[PDB]
């Protein structure tokens with residue numbers, strides 16, 4: 550055990566950081582997770598996640614959590630519709646595929662992971678602001694909270710991580726598309742037409758450079774996403790002002806059936822976010838003052854257009870913890886290096902599929 554008298558600090562308790570903690574902890578490795586969120590009941594904004602066979606489900610299997618993911622997750626059909634609300638295609642989940650990639654709510658998934666860990670593995674209300682290599686141990690600075698030390702830092706703190714410099718100088722880039730996401734509670738009441746259009750399935754529609762995506766049943770809330778090429782004029786919409794978002798969306802969707810509009814009218818608040826990528830373009834720094842690495846979105850943030858986001862992040866966790874558990878390597882540095890080499894290959898494959906899908910979707914005639 551390379552980590553025998555040592556401790557690991559995982560930065561970020563997202564699905565990836567928590568899975569990592571779990572895989573380490575079951576091999577007797579001393580690990581803490583430092584998480585920005587105030588407490589375990591903070592709501593996680595966003596849609597559902599789905600775990601794939603051969604990747605995310607493998608990580609959950611190794612964690613002893615796969616059945617638990619199954620119990621909480623929900624297989625979903627997919628309806629493809631036009632802007633007029635015609636159903637162009639309906640694909641239901643066949644009994645035999647119910648386990649392929651059922652949708653799970655992000656708080657549900659967090660709860661499964663947190664529960665699997667020993668008490669006080671996760672330290673809440675810990676926003677890592679700075680890292681500093683000492684002689685043997687990293688010193689870790691948390692906003693308005695005591696400092697901590699660790700022999701190995703694993704950054705799992707998401708695609709906007711600000712603390713990556715000791716691993717790489719690569720920066721996040723905007724890919725050119727933009728996403729507006731929102732929730733509607735009691736959608737059966739609040740967007741009845743649209744809710745009926747989804748009819749228990751996820752829904753996707755495409756028209757004139759505007760893509761709309763919806764999951765009508767994220768623990769009872771409807772989550773939708775509207776994606777388009779970032780307008781040249783952008784910024785000119787303020788996401789704190791629902792009126793300017795509504796104005797923009799109604800103009801973009803003026804062509805769409807009234808049920809889609811009702812969706813935009815009824816939404817209380819929208820989150821706007823530019824699609825981004827942390828490109829696995831150049832190798833990471835091969836000289837590092839102490840052992841440090843990155844997994845999940847911190848390592849390979851990619852556009853959310855291929856479902857590869859969480860799954861490749863779960864694989865990282867699986868590959869890194871395997872490496873770190875086995876006296877298969879001479880040093881933590883070697884265990885990390887070997888993990889990073891593998892991740893560059895499947896990571897880069899996932900990024901290319903995300904990028905390619907993103908391009909393919911936003912061309913003049915896209916048809917799902």
Ligand SMILES: Cc1cc2nc3c(=O)[nH]c(=O)nc-3n(C[C@H](O)[C@H](O)[C@H](O)COP(=O)(O)OP(=O)(O)OC[C@H]3O[C@@H](n4cnc5c(N)ncnc54)[C@H](O)[C@@H]3O)c2cc1C
Pocket residue numbers: 560561562563564565566583584585586595596597598599675676677678705706707708728730822844845846847853856857858859860862
């Ligand atoms: C709009 C959108 C839709 C998406 N849809 C999908 C999808 O359908 N399927 C899919 O696979 N992927 C999707 N993705 C990506 C997916 O959500 C992430 O890949 C997934 O959550 C795994 O990421 P992670 O654990 O590596 O990082 P995150 O989920 O981002 O978690 C990072 C964690 O670190 C914490 N943190 C951040 N800063 C600090 C700090 N300084 N100190 C301590 N903690 C910190 C955060 O609070 C968070 O808990 C989507 C992304 C976006 C933006």
Ligand SMILES: CN(C)c1ccc(O)c2c1C[C@H]1C[C@H]3[C@H](N(C)C)C(O)=C(C(N)=O)C(=O)[C@@]3(O)C(O)=C1C2=O
Pocket residue numbers: 610615616619648
């Ligand atoms: C073959 N066996 C009778 C059946 C029949 C119908 C089923 O729907 C299922 C099984 C086996 C079990 C294996 C169990 C196992 N475990 C007891 C939790 C298990 O770990 C697996 C697995 N793939 O490792 C499952 O798929 C599993 O979670 C599962 O989803 C099953 C399952 O869905």
Ligand SMILES: CN(C)c1ccc(O)c2c1C[C@H]1C[C@H]3[C@H](N(C)C)C(O)=C(C(N)=O)C(=O)[C@@]3(O)C(O)=C1C2=O
Pocket residue numbers: 596728730751753762763764772773774775776853854855856857906910917
């Ligand atoms: C159609 N498109 C190419 C694909 C292909 C494979 C996929 O696995 C997926 C998509 C679309 C994207 C839509 C994105 C959307 N957005 C870009 C984040 C989105 O808002 C939703 C949603 N339900 O609200 C998704 O389903 C979504 O997260 C998702 O899970 C997708 C997804 O899983």
